[PDB]
């Protein structure tokens, strides 16, 4: 399951 970040849920890593 993917690591996302911020109010935009940007793809950060897996």
């Amino acid at each position: 399951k993917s690591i996302r970040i911020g109010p935009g849920q940007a793809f950060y890593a897996t």
Epitope: R4, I5, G6, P7, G8, Q9, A10, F11, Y12, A13
Partner: antibody, heavy 122, light 110 residues
């Protein structure tokens, strides 16, 4: 270096509609995850929604309280994300901030616009 | 699912404070925390992301940590220009939204 310039702010009657624009310079818009956060006068920060990059879903997500009333969309060729608001309630009165976020060289970058005040009043 | 923070914090200059942020298993327990700084009448600005990573250009005096369902922001060598509202934030899986904590107002005594 990076500027998110918002426009479209102002006064709208309850039940009315208003479109905010956020135009990005200095970031490659097409690679930026775009989002919106609002803040009522004197209150905290409340998430409104986002829209993914085309390469990601290209799809939008919404706060429960704005779902069905607000639509977020993006025009990659014009470096602009929009927040289209309909059936506005007095409760929606707030400064609306857009964010652009990119991931580069394992660096996360998130930049905020200056805000646009939306006043929902009769 | 609301990230609670103490309303206020007040510590002398040259000194250090820790702003606390406590959430639940559905947010901080699944996702990372970010921290934002908002100076009166200015746009919020990202300080920390992914629990402990500083945004570019942000002073090394700031550091963040996550521990279970709690998060913390450390400000060392306190300067008067640090007076602002500090907000934690995290994605909540169960209601599928980005949650901002209630926010702490920081006062640098002196």
């Amino acid at each position: 270096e990076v500027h998110l310039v918002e426009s479209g702010g102002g006064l709208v009657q309850p039940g009315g509609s208003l479109r905010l624009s956020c135009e990005v310079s200095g970031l490659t818009f097409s690679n930026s995850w775009m989002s919106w956060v609002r803040q009522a006068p004197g209150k905290g920060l409340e998430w409104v929604g986002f829209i993914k990059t085309k390469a990601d879903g290209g799809t939008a997500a919404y706060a429960e309280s704005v779902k069905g009333r607000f639509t977020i969309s993006r025009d990659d060729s014009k470096n602009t994300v929009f927040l289209q608001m309909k059936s506005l309630k007095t409760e929606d009165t707030a400064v609306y901030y857009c964010q652009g976020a990119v991931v580069i060289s394992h660096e996360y970058i998130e930049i905020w616009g200056q805000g646009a005040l939306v006043t929902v009043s009769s | 699912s609301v990230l609670t923070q103490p309303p206020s914090a007040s510590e002398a200059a040259r000194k250090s404070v820790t702003i606390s942020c406590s959430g639940g298993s559905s947010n901080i327990g699944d996702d990372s925390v970010s921290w934002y700084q908002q100076v009166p009448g200015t746009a919020p600005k990202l300080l920390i992301y992914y629990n402990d990573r500083r945004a570019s250009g942000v002073s090394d005096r700031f550091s963040g940590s996550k521990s279970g369902t709690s998060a913390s922001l450390a400000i060392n060598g306190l300067q008067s220009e640090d007076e602002a509202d500090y907000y934690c934030a995290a994605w909540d899986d169960s209601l599928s939204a980005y949650i901002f904590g209630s926010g702490t107002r920081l006062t640098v005594l002196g």
